[PDB]
C-alpha cells in the first residue's frame, strides 16, 4: 500500500494529458481577452464634454453636456479583407505564407447622450442635467484588431481535431502559444518583476546616509495595476545628531517628510496614538527609544492642518495659496498614498495602521531583531505573461483612442457639426499599436521607444521541436546585462521546482534568462472578494475597531498585501482555508501562508505566482493513515481506467483536476513552501514513518545504489511529498540521460546545445516557407530515454541519431575535442541533412502608379543590371521549381521604372527606361529551387516566395555533440576498411578521444553508452531518467548476460594491419546530434572587394564580402613582436590607404589637381610649397570632422623648430 514510481509517472502522465506545455501563455492570453479587456474598457467607459455658454451677448445661450458610454466588447474570429473588398475567415498558415497578422477585429457598443442644464445661471459644476437626447440602442463599432494567440480559445484551431489540422496544413504537435505578425511568429517572453503590495526592508550599505529603507510598491488590483511606490528611510547616525530620524518619501513630494508629520496629516496627532500605531508593545523600550528622536524632530507641527500645510508647501507646485496647498496635500494623502489599501474618503485609520506596520518592520531590521529581506527570494517575485502585458498595452491604446474620440467631440461641438460615432474612433490606434509592440518587441508607444521595454516579443525559435518548447516557456529578468551583479544571476534555493536548475544561457544572460520547470504553474489571478468575505464571516476583526493594546498576541491577516484585520485563532482559520482550497471552494492558485514567528496570515490571489504541485500527506490527528499520502492506489487505478475511456464525457473523466479537486494534489508557491515539510519521495515518507514507529529502518542495502542520509529523527510529520524529483528540470534538461551523473555545467552546456540540434521541427515543414530550416534525413529516437520524453514528444520528432561510438586514440585526428567519423556511414546517410532557405519579394507601389514589375529584365532597357545570370528566369520574372542555381544567379526578376527626367551621362539610352532591382541568390550558397509560392499581399500586389533546398553531408569541420556537453568537430573521416573492428565486424561510426572524459567527468556519457548497448542488444528501451534505482552494476550484469564484457569493453583489431589492439576499446551506441554549425556556413576569405562609403574600409560580414577586424589586441600583439611593417601593411596598405596634399605653410589639406599637376591653398595663396602625405582614409575623415568643430589639426612634414 505504498506509492510506486510507476504510479508517480501515471500521475505525471495525467498532468500532461490535461496540461499543455504552452498552457501558461494560452491561459494568460485567455484571461486577458475574456476578462481584462472588458475591465479596461469599463475603467474608461464614459467620456463627458461640458459646452458652457460663452458670453457672446446673444439670447439663446444654454450650456450643454455630451456623453459617450462604451459598452460591452465583441471579439469576432480572425478574418481578412482583400484588395477587392471580399472578407473571408483567415487561417494561420495562409497568414504565415502571405505575411498577414493573425488578428481578430474588436467592436465596442457605444451609446451617445445629450443633456441640457436646467438653469444656466447656476455656478459651474452645480448645473442640473436634463435628458435632452439619447440613443435608443447601442452602435456596435469596430475599434481595432487584436492579434490572436495561436491555439487559444479565440483561435480558429481551438477544439479542432487532428485530421482537420492536416487539412489546414498545421502540425498536430505544435502547441500554439504565439502570434503571427506580418507572417512572422512571435512569442512573448515572460517578464520577471518584484511583487507589488509587499513591504521589503533593505539595509543600505555604508557610507550611504540612509541606514535602512522600507519600501512598498503599491498597486491597485485592477485600476491600472501599479502606480504608487513609497519609502520609509531611517537616516544614519551622525556625529552631530544623537538619534536617527524616520522620513517618508511620498509621490509628488520633493522632500522626505518626517514620519510623525505624515501621521498627523492622517489624524493621529497625539504622540501616544502614534507610538501605539508603531510600537504595539508598551513594555518594549528599545522601539520607543528609537522613535523618540523623530517625535523631537516633528514637534513644531502639532495639528492636522499644519501637517497638511507642511506637506503642501513641499509639493511640486510653488507660489500657491494655502487653501490650494492643503487641498493638494489631502489629495495626495488620500489617492497617492498606499492606493492598494484604499483610495476613498474616510480611510485614514487603515493607512495609518499600515504605515505604523511598515515602520515597525523597518525598526525591527534596524534593531537587528530580524534579518533584512532577500530581493531574490522567488516567492517575492511575479511573472508577467502575455496576459498582463497585453493588458497594460491595451489600456494605454484604449486611453489614446478615447482621447482621440474626445478631441473629435470637442472639434465637432466647436463647429456645430453633427457627431457620428463611427467616424469618431480612429480604429488604427489599437490595431497599429498592438501590431507594432508585438512585431518589434519594443513595448509601448512608438514615440517612447527609448523609454519603452525591449525584447518582450521574440521570433519563435523553429530549429527543433524541443527548442520551440523551450522558447514558449522562457522568462527574462530585466536586470542590467552589463552590470556585474552575481546575486540575481545565481540559482536561488527557492528556484527548486519552479525554474530549471540547468537550462540557462552561457554569457551575459547567464542566470537572468530562466526556463520554467515541467510542472510549474503560473497563476493567472483570481478575485479576492470571496476570500475576504470568508475571512469576515469566520471571525476577522476589522482594522477600524482594532486596538493593539487589547490584543497584542493576535495575528494580523493580510490579503494581497492589504492588512484587513486581526484574528485570534489563526491556526483553525488556516486549516479551514486550506480545506476549502483542497475542495476548490477557493481557487487553487491562492497562497495561504501562516507565518508563526511574525504572527501573520498572508493570503495571495494575484497573478504571476509560480506554483508547483505536490502530494498531500495525511496529517489528520485521528486518521488511521498518519504519514501516508492522501492519494491511494485506488486513485491511481482510476487514472489508468479513465485514461483510455473516451465514451465518458471529455470533462467528466478522472484525471489531474479530479486529484486537485479531491484534495490529493496541492499547488504551492515559494512563499508557501516555507511553511511545509516536503518528502522527496514516497519511500522517504515510508522510511520516516517506520523510523517514527520505533522500527530500526535497517536492511541490507545494494552497495551500488545512491546512498541517502538516514531519515532525520527531528522530523515527525511531513506535510507534502514530491511526485517526482525529475520534474524540477526544464524541457531540454529533461532530454539528458542520467543528468545526475554529470558535472552540472555539462548539463547546462547540453541544455544550450540541444536547441541547435538538427531534426524535424514540425511535421508540416514541407508546406511551411520558413526563412531557414535544417532537417535530418533519418532521425532516430534515442536508445536511452528519460520518462519525461513522452511528454516532450522527443521520440516523435527526435533531433539526432544513435551512432556506434568507440572511445579510442586512433591516428590522433580526434584530439582537442575532434572526432573521427566513418566515411562509409556518411555515404549511407548518417547525419545527412537538408537546408532550406526562403527568399521573399513583393511588388511595391507609391501613390497611384506601380513602380515595380516582376518581369524578365532585358539588357536593352533596364539600367544597372546585376552580373548574375538572367537565363534561369521564366517569362513571369520568376524561377521554376527544380532548377539549379548557384552564387549570384537571379531567382526573382524585378524592375522599377526610372523618371523620364533623369539623364545618367547618356548611359541611359533612349531605350533605357527601367532599372533592375532583381533578387540574386546568396553569393555563398547554391542549390535547387524547391518551391515558388505566388500570391497577393494585403495591398493586392503580387507577392512571391522562393524556397531553395540544399543537401548537407557531414564533412570535416562540422559540429556534433552528445547529450552531455561533449561537442566536437569532424577532424577526419576513414572508410570501412581502415577503422578498428570487433570480432563481429562492428565498425564504429564515430571515434572520440578518451581525454574528453576525465576532466569533464561526464560519467553520464559512459553510462549512456553501456545502457544503449544493452538496449540495442535486448530491444527493451533504456530508462535514463534521473534519480532512479538504475545502477551501473545492474546494467553491467545485463550487458554480461548478452555475451559481452560487463563494462562495455571489446577486443578490437587494427584496420590497417588486422592486428589485435593491445588495449580493449569502449565501444557502443551513443546518441549524437548534428549541430547547426557547419564549416561551409563559416569559411570566409577576402582579398579585395566592397568598402564602406564613409570610411572606405572593408565592409563587415561574411555574407557581404567583408574583411576581418584587425583589432586593438592584434595591434598590441604585433607591437610586442616588433613588426612595424606588419602593422603598417595591415592598418594602411590593406585597409584604407589614401593620399592627400598638405600645405607646408598652414598644414591643412590643399586643393590638388593631379590631372593638371596643380596644387593650391587659397587661405595662404600657396601654389609652390606643398607636401604629399600617405595616411588612412579614416585619418583624413577624422581630421575633417575635427575641422568641422573649428579644431585645426595641422600636419607639418618638416620640423618647425
Amino acid at each position: 500500500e505504498t506509492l510506486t514510481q510507476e504510479d508517480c509517472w501515471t500521475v505525471i502522465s495525467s498532468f500532461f494529458e490535461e496540461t499543455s506545455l504552452a498552457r501558461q501563455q494560452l491561459f494568460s492570453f485567455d484571461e486577458f481577452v475574456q476578462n481584462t479587456m472588458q475591465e479596461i474598457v469599463d475603467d474608461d467607459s464614459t467620456l463627458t464634454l461640458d459646452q458652457y455658454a460663452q458670453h457672446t451677448g446673444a439670447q439663446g445661450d444654454v450650456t450643454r453636456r455630451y456623453e459617450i458610454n462604451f459598452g460591452q466588447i465583441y471579439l469576432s474570429r480572425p478574418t481578412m479583407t482583400e484588395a477587392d473588398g471580399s472578407t473571408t475567415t483567415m487561417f494561420p498558415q495562409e497568414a504565415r505564407l502571405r505575411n498577414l497578422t493573425y488578428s481578430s477585429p474588436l467592436y465596442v457598443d457605444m451609446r451617445k447622450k445629450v443633456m441640457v442644464a436646467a438653469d444656466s445661471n447656476v455656478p459651474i459644476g452645480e448645473e442640473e442635467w436634463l435628458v435632452e437626447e439619447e440613443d435608443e440602442e447601442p452602435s456596435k463599432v469596430f475599434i481595432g484588431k487584436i492579434p490572436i494567440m495561436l491555439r487559444s480559445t479565440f483561435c480558429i484551431l481551438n477544439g479542432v481535431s487532428d485530421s482537420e489540422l492536416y487539412d489546414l496544413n498545421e502540425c498536430p504537435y505544435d502547441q500554439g502559444g504565439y502570434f503571427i505578425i506580418n507572417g512572422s511568429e512571435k512569442v512573448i517572453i515572460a517578464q520577471e518583476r518584484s511583487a507589488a503590495n509587499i513591504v521589503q526592508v533593505f539595509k543600505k550599505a555604508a557610507p550611504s546616509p540612509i541606514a535602512y529603507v522600507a519600501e512598498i510598491r503599491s498597486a491597485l488590483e485592477r485600476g491600472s495595476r501599479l502606480i504608487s511606490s513609497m519609502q520609509i528611510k531611517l537616516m544614519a547616525r551622525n556625529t552631530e545628531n544623537s538619534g536617527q530620524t524616520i522620513r517618508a518619501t511620498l509621490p509628488y513630494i520633493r522632500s522626505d517628510i518626517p514620519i510623525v508629520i505624515v501621521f498627523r496629516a492622517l489624524g493621529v496627532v497625539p504622540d501616544r496614538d502614534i507610538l501605539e500605531h508603531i510600537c504595539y508593545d508598551p513594555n518594549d523600550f528599545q522601539m520607543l527609544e528609537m522613535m523618540k528622536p523623530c517625535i523631537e524632530e516633528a514637534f513644531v507641527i502639532q495639528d492636522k492642518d499644519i501637517a497638511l500645510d507642511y506637506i503642501g508647501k513641499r509639493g511640486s507646485t510653488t507660489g500657491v495659496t494655502r487653501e490650494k496647498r492643503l487641498r493638494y496635500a489631502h489629495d495626495i494623502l488620500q489617492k497617492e498614498l498606499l492606493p492598494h489599501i484604499t483610495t476613498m474618503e474616510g480611510f485614514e485609520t487603515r493607512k495609518a495602521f499600515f504605515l505604523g506596520y511598515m515602520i515597525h518592520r523597518m525598526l525591527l531590521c534596524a534593531l537587528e531583531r530580524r534579518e533584512p529581506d532577500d530581493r531574490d527570494h522567488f516567492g517575492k517575485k511575479r511573472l508577467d505573461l502575455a496576459g498582463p502585458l497585453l493588458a497594460s498595452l491595451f489600456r494605454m491604446l484604449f486611453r489614446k483612442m478615447t482621447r482621440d474620440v474626445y478631441k473629435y467631440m470637442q472639434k465637432c461641438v466647436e463647429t456645430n457639426r453633427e457627431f457620428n460615432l463611427t467616424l469618431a474612433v480612429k480604429s488604427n490606434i489599437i490595431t497599429n499599436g498592438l501590431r507594432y509592440s508585438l512585431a518589434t518587441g519594443n513595448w509601448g508607444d512608438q514615440k517612447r521607444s527609448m523609454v519603452n521595454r525591449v525584447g518582450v516579443s521574440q521570433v519563435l525559435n523553429r530549429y527543433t521541436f524541443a527548442s520551440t518548447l523551450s522558447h514558449l516557456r522562457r522568462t527574462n529578468t530585466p536586470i542590467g546585462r552589463d552590470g556585474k551583479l552575481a546575486k540575481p544571476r545565481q540559482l536561488h534555493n527557492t528556484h527548486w521546482g519552479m525554474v530549471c536548475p540547468a537550462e540557462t544561457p552561457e554569457g551575459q544572460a547567464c542566470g537572468l534568462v530562466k526556463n520554467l520547470s515541467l510542472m510549474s504553474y503560473v497563476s493567472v489571478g483570481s478575485p479576492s472578494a470571496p476570500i475576504i468575505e470568508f475571512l469576515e464571516e469566520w471571525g476577522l476583526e476589522t482594522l477600524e475597531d482594532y486596538n493593539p493594546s487589547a490584543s497584542p498576541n493576535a495575528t494580523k491577516v493580510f490579503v494581497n498585501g492589504v492588512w484587513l484585520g486581526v484574528h485570534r485563532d489563526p491556526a483553525h482559520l488556516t486549516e479551514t482555508l486550506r480545506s476549502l482550497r483542497r475542495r476548490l471552494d477557493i481557487s487553487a492558485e491562492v497562497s495561504i501562508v501562516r507565518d508563526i514567528r511574525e504572527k501573520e496570515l498572508r493570503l495571495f490571489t494575484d497573478a504571476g505566482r509560480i506554483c508547483r504541485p505536490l502530494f498531500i500527506v495525511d496529517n489528520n490527528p485521528n486518521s488511521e493513515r498518519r504519514g501516508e499520502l492522501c492519494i491511494r492506489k485506488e486513485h491511481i487505478q482510476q487514472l489508468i481506467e479513465d485514461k483510455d475511456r473516451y465514451d465518458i464525457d471529455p470533462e467528466q473523466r478522472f484525471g489531474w483536476t479530479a486529484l486537485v479537486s479531491s484534495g490529493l494534489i496541492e499547488y504551492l508557491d515559494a512563499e508557501e513552501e516555507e511553511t511545509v515539510m516536503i518528502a522527496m519521495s514516497p519511500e522517504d515518507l515510508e522510511a520516516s514513518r517506520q523510523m517514527q514507529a520505533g522500527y530500526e529502518v535497517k536492511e541490507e542495502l545494494d552497495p551500488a545504489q545512491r546512498v541517502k542520509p538516514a531519515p532525520n529523527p527531528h522530523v515527525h510529520a511531513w506535510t507534502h511529498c514530491e511526485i517526482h524529483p525529475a520534474m524540477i528540470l526544464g524541457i531540454l534538461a529533461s532530454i539528458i540521460p542520467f543528468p545526475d551523473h554529470n558535472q552540472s555545467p555539462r548539463n547546462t552546456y547540453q541544455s544550450a546545445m540541444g536547441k541547435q540540434a538538427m531534426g524535424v521541427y514540425l511535421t508540416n515543414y514541407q508546406v511551411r516557407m520558413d526563412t531557414m530550416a535544417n532537417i535530418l534525413y533519418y532521425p532516430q529516437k534515442p536508445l536511452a530515454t528519460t520518462r519525461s520524453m513522452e511528454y516532450l514528444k522527443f521520440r516523435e520528432l527526435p533531433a539526432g541519431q544513435n551512432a556506434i561510438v568507440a572511445i579510442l586514440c586512433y591516428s590522433g585526428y580526434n584530439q582537442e575535442d575532434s572526432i573521427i567519423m566513418n566515411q562509409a556511414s556518411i555515404d549511407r546517410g548518417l547525419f545527412r541533412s537538408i537546408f532550406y532557405r526562403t527568399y521573399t519579394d513583393q511588388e511595391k507601389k507609391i501613390g497611384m502608379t506601380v513602380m515595380e514589375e516582376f518581369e524578365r529584365p532585358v539588357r536593352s532597357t533596364t539600367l544597372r543590371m546585376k552580373h548574375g545570370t538572367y537565363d534561369k528566369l521564366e517569362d513571369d520574372g520568376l524561377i521554376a521549381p527544380g532548377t539549379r542555381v548557384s552564387g549570384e544567379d537571379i531567382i526573382i526578376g524585378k524592375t522599377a521604372p526610372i523618371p523620364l527626367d533623369h539623364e545618367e551621362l547618356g548611359q541611359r539610352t533612349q531605350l533605357h527606361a527601367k532599372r533592375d532591382v532583381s533578387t540574386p541568390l546568396r553569393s555563398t550558397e547554391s542549390g535547387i529551387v524547391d518551391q515558388v509560392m505566388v500570391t497577393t499581399n494585403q495591398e493586392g500586389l503580387k507577392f512571391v516566395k522562393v524556397r531553395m533546398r540544399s543537401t548537407r553531408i557531414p564533412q570535416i569541420g562540422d559540429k556534433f555533440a552528445s547529450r552531455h556537453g561533449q561537442k566536437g568537430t569532424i577532424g577526419m573521416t576513414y572508410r570501412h576498411e581502415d577503422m578498428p573492428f570487433s570480432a563481429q565486424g562492428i565498425v564504429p561510426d564515430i571515434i572520440i578521444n578518451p581525454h574528453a572524459i576525465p576532466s569533464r567527468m561526464t560519467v553520464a556519457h559512459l553510462v549512456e553508452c553501456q545502457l544503449s548497448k544493452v538496449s540495442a542488444l535486448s530491444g527493451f528501451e533504456g530508462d535514463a531518467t534521473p534519480f532512479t534505482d538504475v545502477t551501473v552494476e545492474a546494467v553491467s550484469k545485463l550487458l554480461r548476460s548478452h555475451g559481452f564484457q560487463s563494462r562495455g569493453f571489446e577486443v578490437m583489431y587494427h584496420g590497417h594491419t588486422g592486428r589485435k589492439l593491445v588495449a580493449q576499446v569502449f565501444l557502443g551506441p551513443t546518441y549524437y546530434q548534428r549541430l547547426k554549425h557547419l564549416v561551409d556556413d563559416k569559411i570566409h576569405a577576402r582579398a579585395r572587394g566592397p568598402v564602406q562609403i564613409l570610411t572606405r574600409q572593408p565592409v563587415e560580414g561574411r555574407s557581404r564580402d567583408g574583411g576581418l577586424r584587425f583589432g586593438e589586441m592584434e595591434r598590441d600583439c604585433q607591437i610586442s613582436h616588433g613588426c612595424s611593417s606588419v602593422l603598417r601593411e595591415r592598418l594602411f596598405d590593406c585597409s584604407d590607404a589614401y593620399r592627400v596634399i598638405v600645405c607646408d605653410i598652414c598644414g591643412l589639406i590643399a586643393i590638388a589637381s593631379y590631372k593638371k599637376d596643380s596644387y593650391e591653398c587659397r587661405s595662404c595663396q600657396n601654389r609652390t610649397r606643398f607636401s604629399q602625405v600617405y595616411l588612412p582614409y579614416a585619418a583624413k575623415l577624422l581630421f575633417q570632422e575635427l575641422m568641422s568643430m573649428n579644431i585645426a589639426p595641422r600636419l607639418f612634414t618638416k620640423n618647425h623648430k
Partner: peptide, 16 residues
C-alpha cells in the same frame, strides 16, 4: 466553438 471552427474549416472553399 469547436463545432463552429470545424464548420468554418471544412467549408472554406464554399465560404470563399
Amino acid at each position: 466553438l469547436g463545432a463552429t471552427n470545424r464548420e468554418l474549416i471544412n467549408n472554406r472553399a464554399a465560404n470563399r
